[PDB]
Design a protein around this ligand. Structure first.
Ligand SMILES: Nc1ncnc2c1ncn2[C@@H]1O[C@H](COP(=O)(O)OP(=O)(O)O)[C@@H](O)[C@H]1O
Ligand SMILES: Nc1ncnc2c1ncn2[C@@H]1O[C@H](COP(=O)(O)OP(=O)(O)O)[C@@H](O)[C@H]1O
Ligand SMILES: Nc1ncnc2c1ncn2[C@@H]1O[C@H](COP(=O)(O)OP(=O)(O)O)[C@@H](O)[C@H]1O
Lengths: 59, 370, 370, 370
């Protein structure tokens, strides 16, 4: 009785584990893409700051 | 000087000396009186038999319990039972031993006042004290934190305790116990043809309950299984021959603990009152209460009650907590064991109610301070 | 001989030795007392628990802060907390160490007088000194010029400094801090169904605040976004299971720092009081004040608070100045770090208030010279 | 066209027409379901009984309140109760009447959203509105300034008003009310021998509370007096004969409002939360708040509660203010009376939430605008 109890319970544990794992790797993809996005924003900001200081010296 | 521990209970007296591993005297809390005539001159018939002497002359006596639902409802019979316990079972003199009595929570004050008055006046104990059965059960379990479910013969109660602090607003007391299950079994056995109506027959049915009944992990499919095959049927032999065979009654009798609607009560099962008592406690201690459900008393001795209890509470509690039902193999004497441990402590010897304090304050000393 | 630094604060004690890089002991400034009964005889009941021992037993205790708004309002509890800090956490003898206490600006004189009297009498410190939190924060930031916004658990204050000169007429002290945000969050969570009323539940809500709350760069469109989608919802798990999920509360809680009308206060947000304290200074130093806003304290630790602060001050100041919000990653211990630096300076060893000066001058010596 | 006023409450439904002096229908907010078998073929057994029909048949029913602490926790039962209120008690058609519902302050938003959605969809009211109980109580008291203390069956709350302006940051809500006093009395009566466990027995105990309980002016000497003599003992007769007599329980039950630690709560008494709500208000209006404490609701109907309240607040407030507890003799229906007054005003007929506004904005309009 207790054996089949724990067995079904922990097979469902492996179920939520597969789900939480899928969400984990999806969040890893999210993390890497967000690093790339903030890196693109970093080059955006470096470029715009160079432009700002150059053109402000001009002004 | 050693002290006495006298866990009374509504179905079984368990007495002994503080410091032992187990009670020295365990006998039914019962007083029998003869019904029939008595014809043999010179037989020397007694007026009333107590304890297990009334259990062997069972056939000619009418048996009465002086404790109904944790409450002493016949004080002369209770005096007889205490006199027996002291003089014939323990064979001591109560004038030379402090006595530790025990009581369920949430029952009238007159009960404790009369206990104290009886002890001090008609037994001349040097001191006494009235503990709570659940606290002693926790002492015996060897922990200071947990929600103990005590279920004896008259009353079922939960007491949540944390770090040695009781939560008296979350104590929940229920009034179905071993005796109501015995009565429900006496009533449920009539649908197979067996008819027990006498008090002696009530004792027979109690023995049937203690020997053949168990708790089903899943009640519905267990019912269907018993209906399909006949592998659940066992046989019992009454004390005159006449074997009887019972089927689904085996697990329908203790199922009442989880569906008290079988006996027309409105309460919830023991699993649900345990969960409610937990959810009535402060949110920071209930995770440690969830993992220290201590079981105690005789009515918690059915095979499979811990598994069903854990299944039910797990189904109720959040899916992250670790539900642990602690069911020792000797939980029928946990109250007495804990009482002996308590009465043996050195730091307890100032908690007694001395005779002089009683002489000063009256019987009201008991709950007013101790 | 080394000296002690004892940044008290109204939510956390941070103590250590002058010369270290970080406080050696960091525990809640709290004192708990049992509210429930206590049944297990011999459990060794303590009268009161302090520090983070009272934090683990908080299920059965009633917690109290002896400091309300930077002011010590319970001197017995504060003496308990200091005794703990010296003997159980740091494990030293206060008779062998000068002590550097810390205080917020613009709070009653009796506070410092009682501080120094307590030290010199019931601890027999060889010498002591009471600094200002913002000055020490500036020491730790490695500057001599800037307007420092300190925001702890009880009080928020700005202190503008220039070349090491304070402008005491421009000091502005505000009385909403971490604790008022915790209370506002306790009140805002009720509109989702969650009810926290106990002091222990106040600690739970404080942890929710420290884990899930952030400052929105633009409050209105953030509000509309939270109303549109549900991507802002995080989930928290209380210490009994019972996952809760919060939505726009995450940024509605710390937004009170910028709109103190949410809790029914009449003041202006921290950005506006910073700008006002700047504009109360001489027109020559405020260009250097605009570029040295030094954030400090625990309440300045929300994600996105530096950017919102910079946006707001930029919108207020002239369109030519360079607003720079300096927010170190360790800014929660800047006061203690600066206090250790200060107490380690060799030129400081003449600024102590020696025991003999106190014996000559009474407790009034503290503010009268030092 | 006339409008409906439907003060719901957690223990009693009070309905009627806007413009009357008293509610037309007052019945318990309770739904009963049969508990037992049912053997008489053709009796025409109903599925469920509501209102006070479920109260006279309560011997065979299990009663359930669909509102626990001001929150509606069973929406089918609440729909049954509203259907009953409209069709059998008032005997109207909800399609022809605006409806003014009422709600306690500081409770979840889904409550009001579901209220308005239920009304507009399953009753097709032309318009509706959800007021706050304390504001209506102040309307009925004939005032525009005062701190009203409402105390019904589920929740006790203070709302301070000045000149018609609410101070939403000083609103204090507490969750002990009539029902928790009923439960505490059910628990305290067991120490005399009486055992009430059923829901019908809970109704019996509620009536005992409404008939025999009062608030002691000085709790300690009242306790000593009840201990000394026996003149405080009254007698009550259950609905089967079998009289019971209660002593100090009479004033120990409502005393819980002033010491909520009796039921294991950590909050302060109603006097202290009233004082705190006042001291949370601007220093200029609190002199006028001290003199306009308006008592409302059923739980404020104990004899001697106004005197005890005034004594306590006078002991707390400065010795120059004039504390005036305003306790009307009809204060149990103040919320409904004020609701009728409000729904009768000409300048109110633009504050309704028309069906068209709901059709445009969804159920979320109820708090977004009104
Ligand atoms: N092995 C068992 N299985 C099931 N029930 C039992 C068993 N032993 C005792 N009981 C029940 O326990 C009751 C006595 O338990 P006990 O703990 O002694 O009660 P009390 O403490 O009130 O005397 C009896 O009514 C009996 O029905
Ligand atoms: N990571 C965090 N995010 C948001 N708030 C925080 C964080 N850490 C601490 N706090 C807040 O800061 C307060 C403690 O800050 P602290 O600087 O120690 O105050 P004090 O100096 O008065 O002790 C707490 O009330 C808490 O609400
Ligand atoms: N005369 C009375 N004395 C004391 N308590 C009363 C009295 N009448 C009613 N109550 C209490 O008031 C409660 C009902 O009050 P009411 O204001 O109708 O509640 P609600 O506003 O939630 O409907 C009941 O629980 C009852 O215990």
């Amino acid at each position: 009785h207790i054996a089949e109890d724990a067995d079904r319970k922990y097979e469902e544990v492996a179920r939520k584990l597969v789900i939480i794992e899928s969400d984990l790797e999806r969040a890893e993809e999210r993390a890497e893409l967000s690093e790339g996005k903030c890196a693109e924003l970093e080059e955006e900001l470096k470029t715009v700051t160079n432009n700002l200081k150059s053109l402000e010296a001009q002004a | 000087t050693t002290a006495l521990v006298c866990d009374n209970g509504s179905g079984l007296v368990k007495a002994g000396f503080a410091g032992d591993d187990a009670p020295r005297a365990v006998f039914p809390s019962i007083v029998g009186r003869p019904r029939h005539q008595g014809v043999m001159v010179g037989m020397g018939q007694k007026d009333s038999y107590v304890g297990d002497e009334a259990q062997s002359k069972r056939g000619i006596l009418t048996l009465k319990y002086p404790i109904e639902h944790g409450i002493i409802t016949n004080w002369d019979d209770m005096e007889k039972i205490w006199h027996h316990t002291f003089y014939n079972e323990l064979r001591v003199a109560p004038e030379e031993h402090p006595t530790l009595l025990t009581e369920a929570p949430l029952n009238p004050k007159a009960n404790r006042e009369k206990m104290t008055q009886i002890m001090f006046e008609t037994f001349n104990v040097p001191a006494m004290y009235v503990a709570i059965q659940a606290v002693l059960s926790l002492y015996a379990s060897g922990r200071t934190t947990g929600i103990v479910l005590d279920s004896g013969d008259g009353v079922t109660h939960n007491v949540p305790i944390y770090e040695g602090y009781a939560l008296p607003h979350a104590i929940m007391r229920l009034d179905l116990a071993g005796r109501d299950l015995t009565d429900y079994l006496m009533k449920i056995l009539t649908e197979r043809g067996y008819s027990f109506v006498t008090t002696a027959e009530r004792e027979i049915v109690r023995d049937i309950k203690e020997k053949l009944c168990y708790v089903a992990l899943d009640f519905e499919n267990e019912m269907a299984t018993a209906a399909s095959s006949s592998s659940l049927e066992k046989s019992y032999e009454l004390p005159d021959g006449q074997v009887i065979t019972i089927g689904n009654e085996r697990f329908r009798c203790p199922e009442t603990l989880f569906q008290p609607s079988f006996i027309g009560m409105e309460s919830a099962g023991i699993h649900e009152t345990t969960y409610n008592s937990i959810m009535k406690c402060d949110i920071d201690i209930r995770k440690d209460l969830y993992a220290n459900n201590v079981l105690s008393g005789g009515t918690t001795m059915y095979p499979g009650i811990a598994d069903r209890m854990q299944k039910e509470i797990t189904a109720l509690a959040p899916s992250t907590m670790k539900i642990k039902i602690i069911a020792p193999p000797e939980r029928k004497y946990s109250v007495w064991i804990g009482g002996s441990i308590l009465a043996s402590l050195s730091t307890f010897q100032q908690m007694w109610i001395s005779k002089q304090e009683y002489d000063e304050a009256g019987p009201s000393i008991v709950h007013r301070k101790c």
